[PDB]
Structures are given as structure tokens and as C-alpha cells.
Amino acid sequence: NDAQLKFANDVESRIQRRIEAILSPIVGNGNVHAQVTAQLDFANKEQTEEHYSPNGDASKATLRSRQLNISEQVPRSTQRNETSNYEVDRTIRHTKMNVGDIERLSVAVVVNYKLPLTADQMKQIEDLTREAMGFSDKRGDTLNVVNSPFS
Amino acid sequence: NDAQLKFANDVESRIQRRIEAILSPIVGNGNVHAQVTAQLDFANKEQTEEHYSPNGDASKATLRSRQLNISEQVPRSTQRNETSNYEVDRTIRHTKMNVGDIERLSVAVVVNYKLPLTADQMKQIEDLTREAMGFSDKRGDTLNVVNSPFS
Amino acid sequence: NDAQLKFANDVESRIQRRIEAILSPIVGNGNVHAQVTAQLDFANKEQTEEHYSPNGDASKATLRSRQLNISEQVPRSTQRNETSNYEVDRTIRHTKMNVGDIERLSVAVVVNYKLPLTADQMKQIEDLTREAMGFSDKRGDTLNVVNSPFS
Amino acid sequence: NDAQLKFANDVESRIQRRIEAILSPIVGNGNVHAQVTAQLDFANKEQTEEHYSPNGDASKATLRSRQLNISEQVPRSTQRNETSNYEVDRTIRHTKMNVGDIERLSVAVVVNYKLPLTADQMKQIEDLTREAMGFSDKRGDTLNVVNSPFS
Amino acid sequence: NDAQLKFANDVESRIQRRIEAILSPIVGNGNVHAQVTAQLDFANKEQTEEHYSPNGDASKATLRSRQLNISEQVPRSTQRNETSNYEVDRTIRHTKMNVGDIERLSVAVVVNYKLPLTADQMKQIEDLTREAMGFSDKRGDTLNVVNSPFS
């Protein structure tokens, strides 16, 4: 359980070094700081699907057997007994999920002044950090980059 | 689990060296920096499909047995008892997926000035990096190449 | 599973040496650089097909047995009881796929100037590299060759 | 798995030495370079066919037994009960395919100038390389021979 | 293993020495070069045929038993019950194919000048090489003999 905090720090440290490695050529060697918060999924999760292809249409069903009796007397006594045995398409997936994936990333980046960086330069700083995190709106990641003078 | 972070770093390092090896002849030995973020699938995953070819059409069904009784009296008492046993085509795929594939790549590339590189030169830099990652819109890969003066 | 990265590097380095060996006589000993990205299939995959030839036509069906009773009274009471047992043609393919095949190749080639190479020379440089990769539109391979001055 | 790359290199090396051995007497000892890309099938594959000769025609069917009852009263009650047991011709092929065959060949040949070689001399250079490959349009082989001044 | 490439080289070397041994007396000791490409079948293959001679004709059928009841009343109630048991001719071929046969040969022959050889002399050079390969249009063999000055 204590090794899960060491693991989460290893995940955050690599994303942090990656952001400070792609922004240091732009703003300067020490004019950028990044902090990464990684929510990691440490739950053991097993799953087993079992899908069947629908055979409701006769032009795609696979019959194994079929007994079709059709009687008719003409006062029109009509009978139609039909027994059908099918062979069904079946996919069985079995996934044992990985323990230690990333549920969500929260990244805060501060860049020094030089004078406020133009909206153009800050627009591309956000898009590069967005690629250094592995940003994904599916995970609900959040990124905040502010420009303010250092101390 | 800690070996999965070393493995993901080995994947990113190779994609990164490959981008800096095909762009260094163009922009310069040290006028380009690349950072790769690889989302890897470490989940164990088995799958067993089992498809059957449809035999609803009589011109492609394979009969093993067939008992076709046809009675008829002529007041037209008509019977037609038909039992069919089929041999069915069957494919059975069993895939044990590989643990450690790439789900998604996020690559950020910064190239130095020389003056802003023309839109022609930057368009071919993007398409070369696109081939060095192994870019695939199926995986949802993202690539960001910006042109900004270094420090 | 890190030997799969060493294996994927052997695959890429052989395709790379093959491109720099067929273009070196044309453009020069060091006026070409190639980088290959190979997506390799490391999934264990079994498969067992089982096709049957259709015997719906009587001129190509193989009968093992046949009991054909045909009664007829003449008020025309007609009967026709027909049982048929068939011998069916059957193919059974069992394929154990190879672990380590190539799903897709992404090759990036840069060639030095000398002045921009004519569209004639660049069109044949692409066709040679296309043969050195083993390019196949079935795999969805991508190739990019750009002409730009080196450094 | 790595022995499959050494094997694929052995296949390509032999096709390459054979092309440079049949073109060296023509264009010169060092005025030709060839690169071969072999796609080898390393999948284990078994197959078991089982064909039956059709016996729908009575002039080629082989009867083991036959019970033919024919009743007839004359108001014309007619019966005809016919049971038939057949001996069927059967072929059973069992093929265990070879691991390491060639799926596809990609050969790129460059020949030096001397002045561009005439269309006559280049047409026969293509036909000899076509025979040194083992070229086959069934495998989808591709061959590219360009004439370009060396360096 | 790699022993199949050593075996295929042994097959090609013998066909090659045979071509250069029947053409050396004609064109000269070193005025001819041949390269042979052998596509060999290394698949294990068993086959079991089982043919039956048709006995539909009564003048060539072999009866073991026969019960022929023929009733007749004369209003003409006629019966004819005929049971037949046959002895059938049966051939059973079992072939275990040879591993290492030749599926296809591709031979390229170049002969020196002396002046272009007469179309008469080149027509008989092609027909001799055709006999030194073991040429067979069933296998789809290909032969290319060109006449061009050496170096």
C-alpha cells in the first residue's frame, strides 16, 4: 500500500520531467515549473464478455437441423410445424485489467516572464504541455498554465 | 508494475531517438527536441471467436441427411414433411493479445529558428515526424510541432 | 516482453540498411537518411477453419444411401418418401500464426540537395525505397520522402 | 523468433547474389546493385482435404446393395420402393505446410550509366532479373529497375 | 531449417553446371553464364485415393446374392421384388509425397558476342538449355536467354 505512493510518484515524476524537457528550450532552462497529480487505479479488475451474433434474419442464421412439416387440406385446415436448431457465432473476451493505470491527470505549469508572454506564445506552450502529459478528454484530465513573474 | 514504467520509457525513448534522427539532418544537430508520451495496454486479454457460415440459401448449404416426404390426395389433402441435417462451416480463432502494445502516442516537437521556418519546411517536418512515430488516426495519436526560438 | 523491443529494432534496422544501400549509389554515400517504424504483431493467434462443399445440386452430391418410395393411386393419391444420406467434402485448415509479423511500416527518407532534385529523380527514389521496405497497401504502409538541404 | 530474421536474410542474400551474378557480365562487375525484400510465411499450417466423387449419375455410381420393389395393379395403383447403398470414391489429402516459404518478393535494382542505357538493353535487364528472382505474379512480386548515374 | 536453403542451392547448382556444360562447347569456355531459381516443395503431403469401378451396367456388375421375386395375376396385379448384393472392384492408392521436389524453375542465361549471334544459333541455344533444365510447361518453368556483349 505504501508502494502505491512510490509508484504514483514515479508516474508523476516522469510526466513532470517530460514537460520541463519540452518547455525548457522555449522559455528557458529554469523559467518553467510543473507539478503533476496522477489519480491511479489500483483496483484488481477481471472481466469476461460473451457476445452472440443475432440470427433473427434467415439470410444469416446457421441451421444445424430443421424439421419443417407442412400439412394442408382444402374449410382450409392448414398446419405448419417447424423445429429449428441453430449454430450461433460466439465471441468470448476475457480481460484481466492492469493494476496501476491512470484514471486522471492534473497538471499545473507556471512560466516566468521575460513582460507577459504574448497570447500566441502561451497558446503553443499549452499545446506542447498537452502533448507531454498525454492529455485525454476521456480521462477528464485538467491542465492549468499561468504566466507570472518568479521570485 | 515498476517494470511497466521502465518498459514505457523504453518505448518512448526509441520513438524519440527516431524523430531526432530524421530531423537532425534537416534543421540541425541540436535544433530539434521531441518528447513522446506512450499510453500502453498492460491488460491481459484473451479472445475466442467462433464464426459459422450462414446456410439459409439452399445453393450453398451442405446436407448430411434429408428425409423429404411428400403426400398428396386429390379436396386436396397435401402433406410435406422435410427433415434436414446440415454440416456447417466453422472458423474458430483464439487470440491471446500481447501485453505491452501502444494504445496512443502523444508527441511534442520543438524546432529552433534560423527567422521562422517557412510553411513549406514546417509542413514536411510534420509529415516526417508523422512517419517516425508510426502515426495512426485509429489509435488517436496526437502530434504537435511548434517553431519557436531556443535559448 | 522487452525483448520484443529488441526484436522490433532488428526488423527496423534491416529495412533501414536496405534503403540506405539501394539509395547510396544514386544520391551519395551519406546524402540519404532513413528511419523505419514497424508495428509488429506479437499476439498469439490460433485458427481452425472447417469448410464443407455445398451439395445442394444433385449433379455434384455424393450419396451414401437413398431410400426412394414412390406410391401412386389413380382421385390421384400420390406419395413420395425420399431419405438421403450424403458424403460431404470437408477441408480442415489449422493455422498457428507467427508471433512477430509486421502489421504496418512507416518509413521516412530524407535526401540531400546537390539544388532540388528533379521530379524525375525523386519519383524513382520513391519507387526504389518502396521496393526496399516491401511496401504493401494491404498493410497500410506509409512512406515519406522529402528533399531538403542538410547541415 | 530472431532466427527468423537470420533466415529471411539468408533468403534475400541468395536472391541478391543471383541477380548480381547474372547482371555483372552485362553492365559490369560493380555497375549494378540489388536489394531484395522477402515476406516469409512462418505460420504453422496443417490441412486435411477429403473429396468424394459425385455419384448422382447412375452410369458412374457404384452400388453395394439395391432393393427395388415394383408393384402395379390395373384404377392404377403403382408402387416403387427402391433402397440403394453406394460405395463412394474418396480422396484424403493431408498436407503439413512448410514453415519458411516466400509470400512475396520486392526487388530493387539500380544500374550505372556508361549515358542512359537504351530501352532495348534495359528491357532485357528487367527480364533477367525477373528470372533471377523467381518472379511470379501469383505471389504479387514487385520489381523496380532504374537506370541512374552512380557516385 | 536452413538446411532447406542449402538443399535448394544444391538443386540449382546442378542445373547450372549442366547448362554451362552443354553450352561451353558451342559459345566458348567462359562466354555463357546461367543462374537457376528453383521453387521447391518442402511440405509434407500424404494422399489416399480409393476408387470404385461403376457397376450400373448389368453386363459388368458382379453379383454376390440376388433374390428376384416376380408375381403376376391376370386386372393385372404385377409385382417384382429384386434384392441385389454386389461385389465391387476397388483400388486403394496411398502416396506419401516426396519432400523436396521442384515446383518451378526460373533460368536466366547470358551469352557473349563474338557481333550478335545468328537467330539460328540463338534458337538452338535456347532449345539445349531447355533440355538441360528439364523444362516443363506443366511446372510453369521460365527461361530467358539474351545475347549481349560482356565486360
Positive or negative CA dihedral for E119, E121, E123, E129? negative
What does DSSP assign to residue C42?
A: -
d(C-alpha E15, C-alpha E38), whole Å: 9
- Sort E30 into a burial class: Cβ within 10 Å, 0-12 / 13-18 / 19+: exposed
H-helix segments, chain B:
2-27, 119-133
Solved how? cryo-EM
Residue numbers in C near D80 (CB within 8 A) = 68-71
Nearest CB to C131: which of D41, D47, D144?
A: D144
Q: Is D10 on the interface with E (CB under 8 A)?
A: yes
Resolution (A): 2.6
- Scan for cell 542512359, then name that residue: D116
Contacts for B138-141: CB closer than 8 Å, 24+ residues apart: B139/B102, B139/B103, B139/B104, B139/B105, B140/B104, B141/B104, B141/B105, B141/B106, B141/B107
Residue E40: how many other CB atoms lie within 10 Å: 19
- Contact (Cβ atoms closer than 8 angstroms) between residue A80 and residue A67: no
Do D and E touch, 3+ Cβ pairs within 8 Å? The answer is yes
Contact A59 B56 (CB under 8 A): yes
Mutation site, B26, B52, B103, B139, interface C, largest C CB count within 10 A: B26
Residue numbers in B near C51 (CB within 8 A) = 53, 89
Residue numbers in B near A18 (CB within 8 A) = 35, 37
Closest CA of chain D from E7, distance in Å: 13
Q: Which of B113, E13, A117, E121 is nearest to D21 (CA)?
A: E13
Contact D150 C63 (CB under 8 A): no
- Sort C106 into a burial class: Cβ within 10 Å, 0-12 / 13-18 / 19+: buried
Contact B83 A66 (CB under 8 A): yes
Residue E43: how many other CB atoms lie within 10 Å: 17
Q: Which three three-digit cell numbers place residue A141?
A: 484530465
Q: What is the DSSP string of chain D?
A: -THHHHHHHHHHHHHHHHHHHHHHHHH-SSSEEEEEEEEEE--EEEEE--EE----STTT-EEEEEEEEEEE-----EEEEEEEEEE--EEEEEEE--TTEEEEEEEEEEE----PPPHHHHHHHHHHHHHHHT--TTTT-EEEEEE----
Residue span of the structural domain in which A15 resides: 1-42+100-151
Nearest CB to D59: which of E49, E54, E108?
A: E54
Which residues 61-90 of C are in CB contact (within 8 Å) with D? 61-74, 87-90
